[PDB]
Amino acid sequence: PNFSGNWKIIRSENFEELLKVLGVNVMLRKIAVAAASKYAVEIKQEGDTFYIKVSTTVYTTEINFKVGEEFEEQTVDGRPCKSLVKWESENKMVCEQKLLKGEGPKTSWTKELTNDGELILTMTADDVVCTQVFVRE
Numbered sequence: 001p002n003f004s005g006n007w008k009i010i011r012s013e014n015f016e017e018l019l020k021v022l023g024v025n026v027m028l029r030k031i032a033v034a035a036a037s038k039y040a041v042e043i044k045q046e047g048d049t050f051y052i053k054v055s056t057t058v059y060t061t062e063i064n065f066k067v068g069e070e071f072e073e074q075t076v077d078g079r080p081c082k083s084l085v086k087w088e089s090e091n092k093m094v095c096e097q098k099l100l101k102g103e104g105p106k107t108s109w110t111k112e113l114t115n116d117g118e119l120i121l122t123m124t125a126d127d128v129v130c131t132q133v134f135v136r137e
């Protein structure tokens, strides 16, 4: 696997629906969808160690993890969670998230490097799956 790269989004599906399940009100969802339309993901991967920087026009966040080792991050709607990533195959990993406080929809994400060279992210809340596709810059 070489997930390392600078990735730029080309498609985002079901993102508003995801945010709706997570309780985000409609005006904010629309503004969030607009922010997603041009967002970028930078990945540095060394073996099972990942550094990820996710950025939009005005916000940037860093995710650092090793596969199989619990880490802390935030859900899509911004709630702190404990996360654990495992491989599903050579070039796809899945992350299960657990809220640090309170209750809510069951959330997760996946990251896949396709044979065609695209990066596919999925983000899930209960029954709703958002799929986003990126290409290398």
Ligand SMILES: *C/C=C(C)/C=C/C=C(C)/C=C/C1=C(C)CCCC1(C)C
Binding pocket: 032, 033, 035, 036, 039, 041, 052, 054, 055, 056, 075, 076, 077, 109, 111, 121
């Ligand atoms: C491996 C890549 C991952 C786990 C990417 C995660 C990206 C997000 C959680 C981005 C979420 C966004 C919002 C919460 C609002 C603005 C639009 C996004 C897509 C940048």
